[PDB]
């Protein structure tokens, strides 16, 4: 049973740590959400939910 939601993820794979890749088309994968895209720093408001 996999819970992917707000708040930090605590379980990831035995892979090599990196922070992010920026301004490059990569397959992103943050908090279990995946897709193909270009990563830049966020510029919008969020709620804690």
């Amino acid at each position: 049973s996999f819970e992917l939601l707000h708040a930090p993820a605590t379980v990831c794979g035995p892979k090599k740590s990196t922070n992010l890749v920026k301004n490059k088309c990569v397959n992103f994968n943050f908090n279990g959400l995946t897709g193909t895209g270009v990563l830049t720093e966020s510029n919008k408001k969020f709620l804690p939910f």
Partner: protein, 48 residues
């Protein structure tokens, strides 16, 4: 033409362009509060 309005536009022509609102294709280049220019030809139009 009124050589004080942009291009070879008459006072009427000025109203004819200014009073039609364009916010369709090619006027939206970026979407979703993504970073990058939303002006000139300096960044790729990818409307939404």
């Amino acid at each position: 033409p009124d050589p004080s309005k942009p291009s070879k536009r008459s006072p009427i022509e000025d109203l004819l362009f200014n009073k039609v609102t364009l916010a369709d294709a090619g006027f939206i280049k970026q979407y979703g509060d993504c970073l990058g220019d939303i002006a000139a030809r300096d960044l790729i139009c990818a409307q939404k």
